[PDB]
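To assess whether ligand presence alters the predicted conformation, the chain was also submitted together with chloride ion. Input:
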Amino acid sequence: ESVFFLKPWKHFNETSGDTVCVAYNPLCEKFALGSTAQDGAYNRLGNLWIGDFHSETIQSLESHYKLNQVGEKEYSTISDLCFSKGNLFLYTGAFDNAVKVWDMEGNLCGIFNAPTDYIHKLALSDDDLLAVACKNGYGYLLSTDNSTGEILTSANLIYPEALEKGYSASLIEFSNFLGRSSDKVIIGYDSFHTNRGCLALFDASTASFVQKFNTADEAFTSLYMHPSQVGFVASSNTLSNGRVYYLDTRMYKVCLNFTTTQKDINHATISNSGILVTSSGTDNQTFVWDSRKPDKPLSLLKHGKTKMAGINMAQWQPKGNLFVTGGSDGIVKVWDLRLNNPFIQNFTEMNSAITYGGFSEDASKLTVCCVGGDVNMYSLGGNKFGEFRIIE
Ligand SMILES: [Cl-]
C-alpha cells in the first residue's frame, strides 16, 4: 500500500481561493490545480496552475474571469479540469460559463462559448471526447483536434423534462463496460431554484436521450465508476435523508440502494474489491456498507471536531485496498474496512478544513488541499516539503 510510503514533497500556496480540483496527466508527468474565486480578495496569480514533476516548476494560466463592478477583472471559480488522453492539452471548466483548452506551455488553444451558465463538471472518454455538464441544464459533447487543441465538433445532450423542471446538470461520466459496449453518458441533475433532480442516460455516438434511471426526483451529488467499469454508484440528497444507488453497467439498471441519515452527501464510492459502498457527508463521517448485506451500515468512519462542509476527500488507494478520507478537522485518515476497527492511522494534518484530496492513478502522488490555499503534495520521493519554482 503506497500510502505508507508517500512522503512530503512539495508545498504550495500562491493560491487565490481554495484549491478544489487537481488533475494528473496520463503519463503522470504534469499536474494542474484549480481554485475558487475570493470575492473581495487580491489575487495577482491564481486560480489555474500547471506544474511539471521533472522540472519542479509551476506556471499560472490566463484562466477564467469576468469584469467586476469596478471594471477590473476578477477570476471565476474553476469547477473541473482534466488532461487530454493524448497528453498534449488541458481542459478546464469554470463559473464564467466557458470550456477552455490549454497547451502545456499555457497557451489557449480552444474555447467553447455556447454554454449560458456555470460549467459544473467534465468527463473524458477513452477517445478523448469531452463531456460537459452545465448549470443551464444541458450536457455538451465536444471533440478537439489531436494536434492543435481547437474545438472541432459539439453536440447538445438535452433531457426536455429535466429542462422543464429547471434542473441543473451537475455530474457527468462516460460508461462502456471496460470497452465491451458502446459509449454512454450518465448525467446527474440537481436544483438550485430549490432537493430535486434526477439521473439520466444518453448515447454518445448519437448524442440522444436513452432513459431516466428509476429513482425519485432527488438532487444528485456524486457519481463514481468502479475501476472494472462493471458498475457505478450515485448519491443524492432528498427531502429527508440521503441515498446511495448502485447501478449495473450491462442492464443500466438500479440494482441496490442504501439509505443514510446524512442530510448532505458529498461523495459516494465503491471499494476496489467491488463489494463495499461508502457515503461521506457534511457530518464529517463516512457510512460504509457491505453490498451483500445492504440492510445496515457495516461501519461508521468518523472525523473529529471541525477546525473551522465535513468530508471533502474520499478515495481508495489506487492499486490497493485502503480507504482514505479527509475532513474538516484537517486530518487525512487511513482506514482498512477488513479490520474490526478499520482506523489505521492519521496520514497527515493540514492547517484548516480539507477542501480536496486525490491520488494519481499510478499511486505515486497524493495531493491534499485545505481552506486558505494550502496545497500539500506527497510522493514516493522525504521529511520536509520543498517548493515549486514559479515560471512565466
Ligand atoms: Cl433504472
